[PDB]
From Swiss-Prot, chain A:
Disulfide bonds: none annotated. It is a single-pass membrane protein. Belongs to the complex I NDUFB4 subunit family. The gene is NDUFB4. Accessory subunit of the mitochondrial membrane respiratory chain NADH dehydrogenase (Complex I), that is believed not to be involved in catalysis. Complex I functions in the transfer of electrons from NADH to the respiratory chain. The immediate electron acceptor for the enzyme is believed to be ubiquinone. The chain crosses the membrane at residues 75-94. This is NADH dehydrogenase [ubiquinone] 1 beta subcomplex subunit 4. The keyword Transmembrane helix applies. Complex I is composed of 45 different subunits. Keywords: Acetylation, Electron transport, Membrane, Mitochondrion, Mitochondrion inner membrane, Phosphoprotein, Respiratory chain, Transmembrane, Transmembrane helix, Transport. It is found in: Mitochondrion inner membrane.
UniProtKB/Swiss-Prot annotation, chain B:
Belongs to the complex I NDUFB1 subunit family. The keyword Transmembrane helix applies. Keywords: Electron transport, Membrane, Mitochondrion, Mitochondrion inner membrane, Respiratory chain, Transmembrane, Transmembrane helix, Transport. This is NADH dehydrogenase [ubiquinone] 1 beta subcomplex subunit 1. It comes from the Eukaryota. PANTHER family: NADH DEHYDROGENASE [UBIQUINONE] 1 BETA SUBCOMPLEX SUBUNIT 1. It is found in: Mitochondrion inner membrane. Accessory subunit of the mitochondrial membrane respiratory chain NADH dehydrogenase (Complex I) that is believed not to be involved in catalysis. Complex I functions in the transfer of electrons from NADH to the respiratory chain. The immediate electron acceptor for the enzyme is believed to be ubiquinone. The keyword Secreted does not apply. It comes from Bos taurus (Bovine). It is a single-pass membrane protein. GO terms for cellular component: mitochondrial inner membrane; mitochondrion; respiratory chain complex I.
UniProtKB/Swiss-Prot annotation, chain E:
It is a single-pass membrane protein. The gene is NDUFC2. The chain crosses the membrane at residues 55-74. It comes from the Eukaryota. Complex I is composed of 45 different subunits. Interacts with TMEM242. This is NADH dehydrogenase [ubiquinone] 1 subunit C2. The lineage of its organism: Eukaryota, Metazoa, Chordata, Craniata, Vertebrata. It comes from Bos taurus (Bovine). Coiled coil: none annotated. GO terms for cellular component: mitochondrial inner membrane; mitochondrion; respiratory chain complex I. The chain holds residues 29 to 97 of 120 of the full protein. GO terms for biological process: mitochondrial electron transport, NADH to ubiquinone; mitochondrial respiratory chain complex I assembly. Belongs to the complex I NDUFC2 subunit family. There is a minor unacetylated form of subunit B14.5b.
UniProtKB/Swiss-Prot annotation, chain F:
Complex I is composed of 45 different subunits. The gene is NDUFB5. It is found in: Mitochondrion inner membrane. Accessory subunit of the mitochondrial membrane respiratory chain NADH dehydrogenase (Complex I), that is believed not to be involved in catalysis. Complex I functions in the transfer of electrons from NADH to the respiratory chain. The immediate electron acceptor for the enzyme is believed to be ubiquinone. Signal peptide: none annotated. Belongs to the complex I NDUFB5 subunit family. This is NADH dehydrogenase [ubiquinone] 1 beta subcomplex subunit 5, mitochondrial. It comes from Bos taurus. The chain crosses the membrane at residues 21-39.
Length: 118, 54, 169, 97, 114, 67, 457
């Protein structure tokens, strides 16, 4: 997704609220980096580190399936039309092609004379 | 003789189990003796050997 | 040999009249490589063929013919059907490779003429069209997977069309 | 409180107190198993088994049908007009309807 | 047949008809004999005893009991299946009208497409 | 001179040596397989006479190892 | 010849001493698998019966050889696991594989439907105990119950189906006797007769609907990766669809028409999800849905060309997906998590295993004729004779077949591995041997694939 102008450096102000906003971002950034620094720079470890953020990322798709979906609303029915719907779409495509083929075999032959495979 | 028998005891059972399976499954053809010379498809008259082939 | 038709004989003769040059590059390389390792390969093949001496004749091809057709015996019984069903499957497996020989006759025509392609031959073209059309009608090719019991119904379907069309005219 | 739940520990053979091995513990068991009988199946099933597969014992009339077809072609070409297929396993059927 | 008509009610084995000949060293008897040995393996799992295979030698009682009862049980099996067939063949012979014979046909069947 | 990047290598190179040692051990019947075509005759195309249908090998063409 | 030496593996593991066990179970199994290729391959025009109806001959089943191929391979990758626990526990879960091997041989050999049924559901029991134990992550029971209540819910209708046929039309038994079968008249009472025979095999061979049986079994790992190879054997274990459709209902294909359309959408939608998924084992689990969906399409066409592609794909998938799961297990034993993004680093840390990663991935695509080109392409060629529209849908699927393989490669082909400190040794001598024992049998099938596809071939 893209707008009329690409967002990279558009609309920026110093102010007072924005100055403290960058201070909030660096506070968590440095906190999570130092616990990595204490784990990386020692020979006593030998192994793969866990990281709680990455495990929760995999847990977002593998789990949290049935805890969700409790508000179905009209959004779930629209997804059903995009799933079960296209299965019914080809039913009026493959049958019409087969009825075109079956009529040709009995009357007015269309199949090639040099055909033997299957 | 003492070194081989004490160490290996289960190692002999598996190849001997194949021979035991070979003998048992082959002898089942003796239960099905019908259609040996009858029905002309691979039928042949005996000259020296008894009942063509087992 | 015998079964495969192919061309009778090829001409292939060089004249070489225009330009002296170094005779011919194709002719000089052909004479040189014939005695270099081609003659040694012919000598080694002859040395192994003579070393065999004693050889078994062997039966190779098996007989077994007819033994009552499937469209003669009826009613569900294992004693009569099994010999008939083996006969139809024998014919079906051979007819799969009968077409292959006739197909290879058309393959031989394409290379030997090249520029002519469809302008000549005609005999191999007519032979292929007759067999494949007969293979399509008689040996399944439309009536699902191979079955001897279903084959009699397929033959009856073609026979019903012949009886209905001729009666009207 | 966990009481007795904490017991998990990381374990790896790698190279330490093993030199170079695949089997866990004992160098005598490792060499005789992981390199001998592990590779004996590599020599019998793969190398000696390559001779079989489909090559050698004919395998469902693949080579037999070629010799059978060629002699049937030359016989039917000399006498008959129709080549192989014309009326497959049908000679005087008792009506249709 | 479920109800007795010719056979005597409440029999130890058969006694009315003895001629049938029971199976000797049958593959069916070997499986019941295997279960007799198998019962003498899992008994040491209940009462904790060293080695299931090389433990107590009271296993011979468990093998013999399965064979002895099994031989009598399979003797009734061969007997009851014989009586079931005997009454079946007698029903065709006596009535004749119930059974019908048909052989050799040339009937048309519907052929499938694709 | 530099110490450079280090891999395991010792476990890796040994497996390829242990694999090929058992290929070479059963590489002898592969070498015999070539000489079986060379020394012993394979097959010749000939019409069968009514005397014997099958003996040792029933119907086998090409390679002595097939029979 | 086949059964009896397989049964003798049970006293072998128990009688042998505690120091050995694994040496005896693997070596003795390899020589039985050699003898299976020695005798079963011999057949005439129509494949003649082996003996009395207990275990019979093979007509169009070279798939038995695959079960014999995995017979030692289901022990090689399970060596990393089970070693930490008790010696009695080791012997138990080798014998559960032996029991699996005992029942799996019986399914493919015995030419039956009545006694085949009590071997069809009999494979579910040892796998249940295998899945419900040794699972490192939780929800073993939310996969273990789903393992049965998908299969048994669909397969128990075979009792009311198969027995109904033998009570009216002769007897099922030999299948070589089964020519008594008359074509179905096609009525509303005959609808549930066809559905009950199909729905049993609609579960084991995953579609678009009722397909969630398979990913739950794969993601929630039983033991390491060697038991996941037995889960591949269960997919091809429902092979009776080759036998039922041809014999029991030859005229019935009008009711097959909606089921093809279901499996056709079980190709685009099943592949689309197999792109943005997190778990490395799940990206094999959903690709195995679509690869086995190709077989279900081929069966319901009933053309002689389609069965050639059907029988090929049963063996093709049986040694390519199992190969992919062994690679997933080799990363699971080092990183201790099935996450694709976290476990990142080939060639730099895993120099020789990366070439095995390439050969396994490309086999999912149509390579030079190994088995999958003889598998997939044969079905696509047969679908055009059914209808012209098919290849427009089937061609899109051929684009996303790369998107299983290459996405599994690229997301591991980054040589960063900053967070990971483990995986010091790349692969043990057994671990590299696992990868060779899956691809090299398929590389030998390049010369002669006659013993890879044979229903009247």
């Amino acid at each position: 997704x893209x707008x009329x102008x690409x967002x990279x450096x558009x609309x920026x102000x110093x102010x007072x609220x924005x100055x403290x906003x960058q201070a909030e971002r660096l506070a968590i950034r440095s906190r999570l980096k130092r616990e990595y620094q204490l784990q990386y720079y020692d020979p006593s470890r030998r192994g793969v580190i866990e990281d709680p953020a990455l495990v929760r990322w995999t847990y977002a798709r593998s789990a949290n399936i049935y805890p969700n979906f409790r508000p179905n609303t009209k959004t779930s029915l629209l997804g059903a039309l995009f799933g079960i719907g296209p299965l019914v779409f080809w039913y009026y495509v493959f049958k019409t092609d087969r009825d075109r083929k079956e009529k040709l075999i009995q009357e007015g032959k269309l199949d090639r004379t040099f055909n033997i495979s299957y | 003789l003492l070194q081989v028998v004490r160490d290996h005891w289960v190692h002999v059972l598996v190849p001997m189990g194949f021979v035991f399976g070979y003998y048992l499954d082959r002898k089942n053809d003796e239960k099905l003796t019908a259609f040996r010379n009858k029905s002309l498809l691979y039928k042949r008259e005996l000259k020296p050997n008894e009942e063509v082939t087992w | 040999x015998x079964x495969x038709x192919x061309x009778x004989x090829x001409x292939x003769x060089x004249x070489x009249x225009x330009x002296x040059x170094x005779x011919x590059x194709x002719x000089x390389x052909x004479x040189x490589x014939x005695x270099x390792x081609x003659x040694x390969x012919x000598x080694x093949x002859x040395x192994x063929x003579x070393x065999x001496x004693x050889x078994x004749x062997x039966x190779x091809x098996x007989x077994x013919x007819x033994x009552x057709x499937x469209x003669x015996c009826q009613e569900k019984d294992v004693l009569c059907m099994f010999e008939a069903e083996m006969q139809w499957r024998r014919d079906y497996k051979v007819d799969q490779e009968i077409v292959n020989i006739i197909q290879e006759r058309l393959k031989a025509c394409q290379q030997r003429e090249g520029e002519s392609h469809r302008q000549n031959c005609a005999k191999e073209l007519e032979q292929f069209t007759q067999v494949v059309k007969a293979y399509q009608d008689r040996y399944x090719x439309x009536x699902x997977x191979x079955x001897x019991x279903x084959x009699x119904x397929x033959x009856x379907x073609x026979x019903x069309x012949x009886x209905x069309x001729x009666x009207x005219x | 409180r966990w009481q007795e739940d904490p017991e998990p520990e990381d374990e790896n053979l790698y190279e330490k107190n093993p030199d170079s091995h695949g089997y866990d513990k004992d160098p005598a068991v490792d060499i005789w198993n992981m390199r001998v009988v592990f590779f004996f199946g590599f020599s019998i099933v793969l190398v000696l088994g390559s001779t079989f597969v489909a090559y050698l014992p004919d395998y469902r009339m693949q080579e037999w049908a070629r010799r059978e077809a060629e002699r049937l072609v030359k016989y039917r070409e000399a006498h008959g007009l129709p080549i192989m297929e014309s009326n497959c396993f049908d000679p005087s059927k008792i009506q249709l309807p | 047949x479920x109800x007795x008509x010719x056979x005597x009610x409440x029999x130890x084995x058969x006694x009315x008809x003895x001629x049938x000949x029971x199976x000797x060293x049958x593959p069916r008897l070997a499986f019941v004999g295997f279960l007799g040995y198998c019962s003498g393996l899992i008994d040491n799992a209940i009462r904790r005893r060293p080695v299931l295979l090389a433990g107590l030698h009271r296993q011979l009682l468990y093998i013999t009991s399965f064979v002895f009862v099994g031989y009598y049980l399979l003797k009734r099996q061969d007997y009851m299946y014989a009586v079931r067939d005997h009454d079946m063949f007698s029903y065709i012979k006596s009535h004749x009208x119930x059974x019908x014979x048909x052989x050799x046909x040339x009937x048309x069947x519907x052929x499938x497409x694709x | 001179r530099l110490f450079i990047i280090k891999p395991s290598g010792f476990y890796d190179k040994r497996f390829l040596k242990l694999l090929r040692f058992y290929i070479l051990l059963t590489g002898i019947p592969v070498a015999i397989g070539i000489t079986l075509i060379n020394v012993x005759x394979x097959x010749x195309x000939x019409x069968x006479x009514x005397x014997x249908x099958x003996x040792x090998x029933x119907x086998x063409x090409x390679x002595x190892x097939x029979x | 010849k086949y059964i009896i030496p397989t049964i003798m593996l049970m006293p072998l593991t128990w009688l042998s001493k505690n120091n050995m066990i694994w040496v005896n179970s693997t070596a003795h199994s390899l020589l039985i698998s050699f003898t299976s290729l020695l005798l079963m391959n011999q057949f005439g025009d129509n494949s003649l019966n082996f003996s009395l109806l207990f275990f019979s001959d093979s007509l169009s089943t070279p798939l038995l050889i695959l079960t014999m191929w995995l017979l030692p391979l289901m022990l090689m990758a399970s060596q990393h696991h089970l070693s930490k626990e008790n010696l009695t526990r080791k012997k138990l879960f080798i014998t559960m594989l032996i029991s699996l091997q005992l029942f799996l041989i019986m399914t493919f050999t015995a030419m039956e439907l009545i006694l085949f049924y009590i071997l069809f559901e009999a494979t579910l029991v040892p796998t249940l105990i295998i899945i419900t134990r040794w699972g490192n992550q939780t929800e073993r029971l939310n996969a273990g119950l789903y393992f049965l209540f998908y299969t048994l819910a669909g397969s128990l209708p075979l009792l009311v189906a198969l027995i109904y046929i033998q009570n009216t039309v002769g007897s099922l038994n030999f299948l070589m006797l089964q020519y008594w079968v008359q074509p179905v008249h096609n009525s509303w009472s005959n609808v549930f007769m066809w559905l009950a025979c199909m729905m049993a095999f609609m579960v084991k061979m995953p579609l678009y609907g009722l397909h969630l049986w398979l990913p739950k079994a794969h993601v929630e790992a039983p033991i390491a990766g060697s038991m996941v190879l037995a889960a591949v054997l269960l997919k091809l274990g429902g092979y009776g669809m080759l036998r039922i459709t041809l014999i029991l209902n030859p005229m019935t294909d009008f009711m097959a028409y909606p089921f093809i359309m279901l499996s056709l959408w079980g190709m685009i939608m099943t592949s689309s999800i197999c792109l943005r998924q997190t778990d490395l084992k799940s990206l094999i689990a959903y690709s195995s849905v679509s690869h086995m969906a190709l077989v279900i399409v081929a069966i319901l066409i009933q053309t002689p060309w389609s069965y050639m592609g059907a029988t090929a794909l049963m063996i093709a998938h049986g040694l390519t997906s199992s190969m992919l799961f062994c690679l997933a297990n080799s990363n699971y034993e080092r990183i201790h998590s099935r996450t694709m993004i976290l476990a990142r680093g080939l060639q730099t840390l895993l120099p020789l295993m990366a070439t095995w990663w390439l050969l396994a991935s490309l086999t999912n695509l149509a390579l030079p004729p190994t088995i999958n080109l003889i598998g997939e392409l044969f079905v696509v060629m047969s679908t055009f004779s059914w209808s012209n529209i098919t290849i427009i849908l089937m061609g899109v699927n051929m684009v996303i077949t790369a998107l299983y393989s290459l996405y599994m490669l690229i997301m591991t082909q980054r040589g960063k591995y900053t967070y990971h400190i483990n995986n010091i040794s790349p692969s043990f001598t057994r671990e590299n041997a696992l990868m060779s024992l899956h691809i090299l049998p398929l590389l030998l099938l390049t010369l002669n694939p006659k013993i890879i596809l044979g229903p009247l071939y």
